[PDB]
Each structure stands twice: as C-alpha cells, then as structure tokens.
Design a protein around this ligand. Structure first.
Ligand code: HEM
Length: 154
C-alpha cells in the first residue's frame, strides 16, 4: 500500500505533538496494551511480575522501554514508507528473539490509536486517525512479510 503525502502529513503532524513528551506517551501506550491484553505482558520477562497499573506507572524500567519503543516507531514513521533498513533489525529481533506474533502488533496499534485519540483530540480527528491506521497497517504488512522471509509465522 501507499500513503499519499497528505496522509503522511496528518501522521507526522500528530506525531510532532507526541514528541513533546516521548516518555509519557510510551508509558501510557504500554500500560494500555497490558491492561487491554494482559497476555502480552507475558512476553516481557523484565516486566511480567508487575501486578497493577500503579506498579506499572511506578516502574522506571517500563518507562525507559516505552522511550526505546516509541523512538524506534517514530524513526520508521518519519521515513514515510521508505523504511526497509529500519525494519530489518526490528523484524529479526521480534521474530527470533522475542517471538511476537503479528496479532500482538495489531494490539499495540490499537493501543497507539487509543492513546492519541485520548490525548490529542483536536489533531486526531477521523481523517487523521484513518491516516495513522493506514501507516500502522503498512508497517504491520511490511513486518509480516519480513517475518515470513525470516522463517517465523509468515
Ligand atoms: C510498533 C511496534 C514495536 C516497536 C517499534 C518495537 C521496538 C522495540 C525496540 C526498538 C526494542 C529494543 C531492541 C530489540 O530488541 O529489537 C524492543 C524490544 C522488545 N520488544 Fe518491541 N517493539 C514493538 C512491538 C512489540 C510488541 C507488541 C511486543 C510484545 C507484545 C514487543 C516485545 C518486546 C520485547 C519482549 C522486547 C525486549 C524488552 C527487554 O527485555 O529489553 N515489542 N521492541
């Protein structure tokens, strides 16, 4: 699939706001993911033991990982579709080291869209949400094809 330049502008316009508080957004997103789909928390051997949302908020480690994850996703969205290099090392680790099924990438996509809707309603109307959703669908599609080349799932 190919986004238009007007669709990438809606995605990078709301991302510019996210980047004013990277740690905050990375933390909200992971917590939302772990609350909504608790099974995903099991894939993190470093966080697995956190029992409540209050424990998750207080975790400095979780907050450091939210920064790492969001910064890597930002770098991919700023490429505007030309992200092949950035996707290779990410596909290799998530398929072979971490073993993250595509279904979980769909769950985190849902958590990203929930948090931006919540924190940025004026910049995340229907058209902006449709463009972000396309950008994450493009990312999931490319990653799924790389997973299949690497021998995982498909
Ligand atoms: C937009 C999607 C995602 C991005 C951009 C992202 C990026 C990252 C990055 C940059 C790292 C550190 C380097 C590496 O190991 O590759 C990482 C680590 C990891 N990721 Fe992801 N990731 C994504 C989705 C997920 C999903 C949905 C899960 C689990 C449900 C997941 C589980 C992990 C785990 C288990 C690690 C290791 C954490 C630790 O022990 O250090 N990732 N991820």
């Amino acid at each position: 699939m190919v986004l238009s330049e007007g669709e990438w502008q809606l995605v990078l316009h709301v991302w510019a706001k996210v980047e004013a508080d990277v740690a905050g957004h990375g933390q909200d997103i992971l917590i939302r993911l772990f609350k909504s789909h608790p099974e995903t928390l099991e894939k993190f051997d470093r966080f697995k033991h956190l029992k409540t949302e209050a424990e998750m908020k207080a975790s400095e480690d979780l907050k450091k990982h939210g920064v790492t994850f969001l910064t890597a996703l930002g770098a991919i969205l700023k490429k505007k579709g030309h992200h092949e290099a950035e996707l290779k090392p990410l596909a290799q680790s998530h398929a072979t080291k971490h073993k993250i099924p595509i279904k979980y990438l769909e769950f985190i996509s849902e958590a990203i869209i929930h948090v931006l809707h919540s924190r940025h309603p004026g910049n995340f109307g229907a058209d902006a949400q449709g463009a972000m959703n396309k950008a994450l669908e493009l990312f999931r599609k490319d990653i799924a094809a790389k997973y299949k080349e690497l021998g995982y799932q498909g």
